Design an enzyme around this catalytic site. Structure first.
Site, mmCIF file in Angstrom:
data_model
loop_
_atom_site.group_PDB
_atom_site.id
_atom_site.type_symbol
_atom_site.label_atom_id
_atom_site.label_comp_id
_atom_site.label_asym_id
_atom_site.label_seq_id
_atom_site.Cartn_x
_atom_site.Cartn_y
_atom_site.Cartn_z
ATOM 1 N N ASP A 1 -39.337 6.584 -18.730
ATOM 2 C CA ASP A 1 -39.221 7.526 -19.820
ATOM 3 C C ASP A 1 -38.515 6.911 -21.030
ATOM 4 O OD1 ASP A 1 -40.592 9.740 -18.805
ATOM 5 O OD2 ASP A 1 -38.852 10.379 -17.605
ATOM 6 N N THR B 1 -35.593 19.225 -19.004
ATOM 7 C CA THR B 1 -35.420 18.637 -17.692
ATOM 8 C C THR B 1 -34.575 17.364 -17.735
ATOM 9 O OG1 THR B 1 -37.575 17.749 -18.152
ATOM 10 C CG2 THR B 1 -37.480 19.551 -16.598
ATOM 11 N N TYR C 1 -31.014 15.652 -20.184
ATOM 12 C CA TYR C 1 -29.581 15.968 -20.304
ATOM 13 C C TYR C 1 -29.315 17.466 -20.230
ATOM 14 C CZ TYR C 1 -25.002 14.281 -22.204
ATOM 15 O OH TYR C 1 -23.705 13.866 -22.390
HETATM 16 C C1 LIG Z 1 -27.610 9.589 -17.026
HETATM 17 C C2 LIG Z 1 -28.009 8.604 -18.124
HETATM 18 N N1 LIG Z 1 -29.424 8.724 -18.495
HETATM 19 C C3 LIG Z 1 -30.426 8.372 -17.660
HETATM 20 O O1 LIG Z 1 -30.237 7.840 -16.562
HETATM 21 N N2 LIG Z 1 -31.652 8.633 -18.132
HETATM 22 C C4 LIG Z 1 -32.870 8.212 -17.457
HETATM 23 C C5 LIG Z 1 -33.338 9.217 -16.429
HETATM 24 O O2 LIG Z 1 -33.692 10.445 -17.109
HETATM 25 C C6 LIG Z 1 -35.052 10.696 -16.873
HETATM 26 N N3 LIG Z 1 -35.569 11.455 -17.989
HETATM 27 C C7 LIG Z 1 -35.688 11.118 -19.331
HETATM 28 C C8 LIG Z 1 -35.163 9.911 -19.846
HETATM 29 C C9 LIG Z 1 -34.717 8.943 -20.381
HETATM 30 C C10 LIG Z 1 -34.157 7.692 -20.919
HETATM 31 N N4 LIG Z 1 -32.717 7.715 -21.099
HETATM 32 C C11 LIG Z 1 -32.199 6.354 -21.279
HETATM 33 C C12 LIG Z 1 -31.947 5.668 -19.968
HETATM 34 C C13 LIG Z 1 -31.982 4.155 -20.106
HETATM 35 N N5 LIG Z 1 -32.224 3.510 -18.789
HETATM 36 C C14 LIG Z 1 -32.223 8.545 -22.217
HETATM 37 C C15 LIG Z 1 -32.129 9.999 -21.807
HETATM 38 O O3 LIG Z 1 -31.135 10.132 -20.779
HETATM 39 C C16 LIG Z 1 -30.757 11.507 -20.762
HETATM 40 N N6 LIG Z 1 -29.370 11.599 -20.372
HETATM 41 C C17 LIG Z 1 -28.271 11.115 -21.031
HETATM 42 N N7 LIG Z 1 -27.131 11.425 -20.460
HETATM 43 C C18 LIG Z 1 -27.509 12.167 -19.351
HETATM 44 C C19 LIG Z 1 -26.767 12.828 -18.348
HETATM 45 N N8 LIG Z 1 -25.432 12.821 -18.289
HETATM 46 N N9 LIG Z 1 -27.448 13.528 -17.419
HETATM 47 C C20 LIG Z 1 -28.783 13.555 -17.487
HETATM 48 N N10 LIG Z 1 -29.591 12.965 -18.375
HETATM 49 C C21 LIG Z 1 -28.885 12.288 -19.287
HETATM 50 C C22 LIG Z 1 -31.028 12.088 -22.145
HETATM 51 O O4 LIG Z 1 -31.942 13.167 -22.019
HETATM 52 C C23 LIG Z 1 -31.597 10.887 -22.922
HETATM 53 O O5 LIG Z 1 -32.617 11.281 -23.825
HETATM 54 N N11 LIG Z 1 -36.279 12.047 -20.062
HETATM 55 C C24 LIG Z 1 -36.532 13.062 -19.142
HETATM 56 C C25 LIG Z 1 -37.099 14.342 -19.288
HETATM 57 N N12 LIG Z 1 -37.599 14.814 -20.433
HETATM 58 N N13 LIG Z 1 -37.180 15.118 -18.187
HETATM 59 C C26 LIG Z 1 -36.729 14.641 -17.023
HETATM 60 N N14 LIG Z 1 -36.168 13.457 -16.764
HETATM 61 C C27 LIG Z 1 -36.098 12.713 -17.871
HETATM 62 C C28 LIG Z 1 -35.684 9.329 -16.602
HETATM 63 O O6 LIG Z 1 -36.918 9.501 -15.930
HETATM 64 C C29 LIG Z 1 -34.596 8.760 -15.706
HETATM 65 O O7 LIG Z 1 -34.670 9.335 -14.420
#
Ligand SMILES: CCNC(=O)NC[C@H]1O[C@@H](n2c(C#CCN(CCCN)C[C@H]3O[C@@H](n4cnc5c(N)ncnc54)[C@H](O)[C@@H]3O)nc3c(N)ncnc32)[C@H](O)[C@@H]1O
Ligand SMILES: CCNC(=O)NC[C@H]1O[C@@H](n2c(C#CCN(CCCN)C[C@H]3O[C@@H](n4cnc5c(N)ncnc54)[C@H](O)[C@@H]3O)nc3c(N)ncnc32)[C@H](O)[C@@H]1O
Ligand SMILES: CCNC(=O)NC[C@H]1O[C@@H](n2c(C#CCN(CCCN)C[C@H]3O[C@@H](n4cnc5c(N)ncnc54)[C@H](O)[C@@H]3O)nc3c(N)ncnc32)[C@H](O)[C@@H]1O
Ligand SMILES: CCNC(=O)NC[C@H]1O[C@@H](n2c(C#CCN(CCCN)C[C@H]3O[C@@H](n4cnc5c(N)ncnc54)[C@H](O)[C@@H]3O)nc3c(N)ncnc32)[C@H](O)[C@@H]1O
Lengths: 261, 261, 261, 261
Positions: free
Chosen positions: A45, A158, A160
């Site tokens: 993603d 779905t 953050y």
């Molecule tokens: C905890 C740090 N972040 C991650 O580990 N992010 C990756 C994970 O998130 C999944 N993901 C993404 C994505 C993405 C890419 N990310 C960069 C990672 C680099 N390797 C950025 C995205 O990170 C999200 N993020 C940030 N902080 C977070 C948190 N504390 N908890 C949960 N999500 C968090 C935020 O929204 C941002 O845009 N878009 C969606 C979506 N639409 N639906 C469902 N799942 C989704 C992706 O498949 C993977 O499983």
């Protein structure tokens, strides 16, 4: 038509990209990363989000497709094993497009920057306490004290948003959703606590109270903004378009990612 | 036009109702509780919900107004002190109507009952464990084990839905929201946990797993249903209409009820 | 005995401090900020936390008292209007001491720093994703991915811990409580979600997975730590002591701060 | 010594019980379900809870062991495949006992019943709204309006308590934990929201406000109580004792049940 392919850059993704290019060479298809009509992202993603931002100025001219080479990504419709099937189907064309809503963030200073988000835009302090007045359609709604705020699109619910306790919303709904990060609540400080869901045309403005410096993230990208007067959120007029070749309903995608697969 | 007035039945409400009737007697207004065009509720939100259900078969012919004689009710636009101003404004008419969406619940047996909700419809077991399969547009989404489920309209999102951790949604959004009541989650039992927000035309069906008896509430009203095969939720085609005489924005109403007033 | 007085530094607090000094001058009391036996903090909880850290090496020799010159602080027992009553009561002495538990944080490198907390110690990444393995008494418990982790003392459970959804715990319980900040949970990433409460002698260790740089806060104080191998949490052997002059039960203090006052 | 064995009553459990009896017949062991010193439960956690209540008057004379014939139960230490190993180890004896704390519920009328809980005691209305005053050590703490309240022991914190957002607490901590079920919170109704953790000797009393009829559950068992004046919660003086034959730490049991196994 004109297409391009981005890769996460590991060996698996680069090779899959080279093989799809070779297969497209057997059709009336021109590789063009200046004015593509189809943008294929091979990765996760994060890769997909980078492709979106690479073409955010031609979103009305482009249909996006995501291939996940790791575990199922939410913007992914295809597994690497379906790449050849994908090449053939895109080749013919005649596919249908689906559109998801986007989030517009405006940052005003003292002098205005705008940003488009596919997942969300968040705001935190640049260090030191985070305090903002939350103004909805010019109505002072609450003074927020805490770690930060997250404004999500429907398809970002779905991501953050989910971790912050937000609702998951079907992407046909033209809305944005505001969630709190660790607010303080006692007899002197009060916020709504609940996620809030806003329709098109509502504007949510954050106004500094003391410190005017903030860290604003849009999707993967976090920027320090200094001397901020206002941060404005509204559902964008612009939409992202996906090429769809078969049914993969949103709620099934949610089931497959969070329940079992 | 034709109007009627319901009262919570304390002395304050009955007297206010008698005085409004006397004031309406000075205008071309006929008291008619069979075919009203205006339904005034004097009381609280419970009173308002009862008025809604008393006229749920003529919702397209009726505009509703709520007066709160206790603290601010969410379906209340007026304080008792504005009753005379209200009489005069309704008298002339020329007011605008606003519409909020409603929730349709269908209960099938072994043989079908339908219900309309302004706040929400909930389901619990009739005693004994609650287990249902949750099916969204015919796609098996999760097996829910826990205390129950709550499906809310937009204007009901500030009611039971809020207490269950649901998002608050602006009522211009045509949607319903499903929240969990105490689900069990371990390595063997799994639910989504997050509230889910559904658009018009999506159908959410609960299907029994073992016990087929359920307690189904619609707004204040809880009924035991036996031998249930299915409970179906969808946004209704029908809407409730309010008479509006001045701006009282939803988000201001939320601020006034939960933040400060 | 020997005493000192810290002030938040506004005019109200400085003047109250000067007046208490003048009143102590009428008793066998020596102002000594090197080896006090009584430390009075005039301000808010931040002021109190700073006083605690200023004397964290003589906690067994000191009893603390907090006066709140703003709204009720949780480490405050007195309002400014009771200062003269306080001077007189401390003068005589014969008061009883109550003890609350503290949190020991150890940071190991590649080389060891320790810290004592009255409210909590938190850990976040130094920018970039936060991923740590959580090891409890040498047992690998979960891999945490998300915004950060908060470990609270009992008296800190009404502070950041509360905002993260932690339980409020009576301070006679010798424990620490670990809460999550926005963890990611999907079919590939899993944490416990629930706050965890640990007794004395249990050790909770965070071990880096990729990035080894972390921002570690102890009470108000946030430090960048580089090249971290381990962060270890345990209930400290050391306790903070309060001078008590009347009953102000913890649960009443909670009621007064969060319910009504 | 004297022992007995309870069975969930499916074929798997009955047969395992018959085979353990046959194996105990090869040792100085007498089957006695009047005055056992060892109580073996073969089933799930529900089976274990029933065994606990069957012997709640001789808890100081009994050590309990749970065998899970379905998926891992939390009061289970053994898989069916270890039954023969268990027989042999119990035979010799010399095992160590571990104790977990219990919850005492007292229900007063208008006239007093007491109950002991291993998991929790909950209270709901007998139909109609649930409203109680919550009194802690005789201090009026809050008026609770909502679906109900749950008071958990430490080992019950991984059961209903967890689903209500409670902290998980190590069972060496002598405490009980109070969690809310869907409380209403607006500008007129206010509760603490957070789980509360109480030490030994604190007493939490629920006092009716209007309706005096309540449904009180203790572990699996739900009773209608009429004309209630008070419901009192405190940590019991009595403890449950387990036979332990090897290390299976609580936190590992938590990992295995909720994280992965
Ligand atoms: C905890 C740090 N972040 C991650 O580990 N992010 C990756 C994970 O998130 C999944 N993901 C993404 C994505 C993405 C890419 N990310 C960069 C990672 C680099 N390797 C950025 C995205 O990170 C999200 N993020 C940030 N902080 C977070 C948190 N504390 N908890 C949960 N999500 C968090 C935020 O929204 C941002 O845009 N878009 C969606 C979506 N639409 N639906 C469902 N799942 C989704 C992706 O498949 C993977 O499983
Ligand atoms: C806890 C038991 N229930 C109540 O005390 N309910 C009354 C309170 O709720 C307010 N209220 C209502 C209403 C109403 C009337 N109620 C009957 C009360 C009879 N005297 C029925 C409604 O109860 C709701 N309810 C049930 N259980 C609840 C719970 N556990 N937590 C929160 N709400 C709960 C549910 O949604 C139902 O329909 N609609 C809305 C709304 N749209 N927005 C915002 N607030 C709203 C009303 O002003 C008052 O403050
Ligand atoms: C949101 C940013 N922080 C604040 O506004 N903190 C001050 C407020 O917290 C109260 N407070 C304190 C305190 C304090 C002093 N603070 C520095 C403020 C400088 N002016 C530091 C403390 O901040 C806490 N903190 C940090 N981030 C937080 C967040 N997101 N949500 C809630 N609390 C948060 C954290 O635990 C830290 O130690 N100890 C306790 C306690 N024991 N019980 C109950 N209340 C307590 C204090 O009366 C005031 O009301
Ligand atoms: C949702 C309806 N209840 C269940 O399905 N309960 C069984 C499940 O719970 C597990 N369990 C038990 C147990 C048990 C036996 N139960 C009867 C079931 C009859 N077949 C009674 C217990 O139910 C709990 N319960 C009730 N309502 C609940 C809810 N909404 N959410 C979560 N738990 C709920 C409550 O605490 C009660 O005592 N003690 C513990 C424990 N100590 N640690 C961790 N897990 C534990 C058991 O292994 C199984 O996985």
């Amino acid at each position: 038509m004109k297409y391009m392919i981005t890769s996460k850059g590991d060996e698996k993704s680069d090779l899959l990209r080279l093989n799809m290019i070779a297969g497209f060479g057997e059709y009336d298809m021109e590789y063009d990363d200046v004015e593509p009509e189809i943008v294929i992202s091979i990765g996760g993603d994060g890769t997909f989000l980078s492709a979106f931002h690479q073409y955010e100025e031609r979103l009305d001219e482009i249909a996006f497709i995501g291939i996940h080479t790791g575990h199922l990504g939410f913007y992914a419709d295809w597994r690497p094993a379906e790449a050849d099937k994908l090449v053939k189907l895109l080749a013919k064309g005649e596919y249908q497009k689906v559109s998801y809503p986007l989030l517009k963030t405006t940052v005003k200073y003292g002098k205005e920057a705008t940003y488009l988000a596919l997942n969300e835009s968040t705001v935190k302090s640049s260090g030191g306490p985070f305090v903002v007045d939350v103004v909805i359609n010019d109505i002072h709604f609450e003074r927020f004290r805490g770690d930060g705020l997250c404004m999500s699109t429907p398809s970002g619910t779905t991501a953050y948003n989910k971790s912050l306790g937000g609702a998951l919303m079907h992407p046909s709904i033209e809305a944005m959703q505001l969630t709190e990060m660790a607010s303080i609540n006692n007899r002197v400080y009060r916020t709504i606590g609940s996620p809030l869901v806003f329709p098109k045309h509502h504007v949510v403005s954050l106004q500094p109270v003391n410190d005017k410096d903030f860290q604003i993230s849009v999707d993967h990208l976090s920027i320090l903004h200094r001397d901020v007067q206002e941060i404005r959120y509204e559902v964008s007029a612009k939409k992202i378009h996906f090429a769809r070749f078969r049914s993969f309903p949103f709620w099934r995608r949610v089931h497959d990612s969070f329940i079992e697969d």
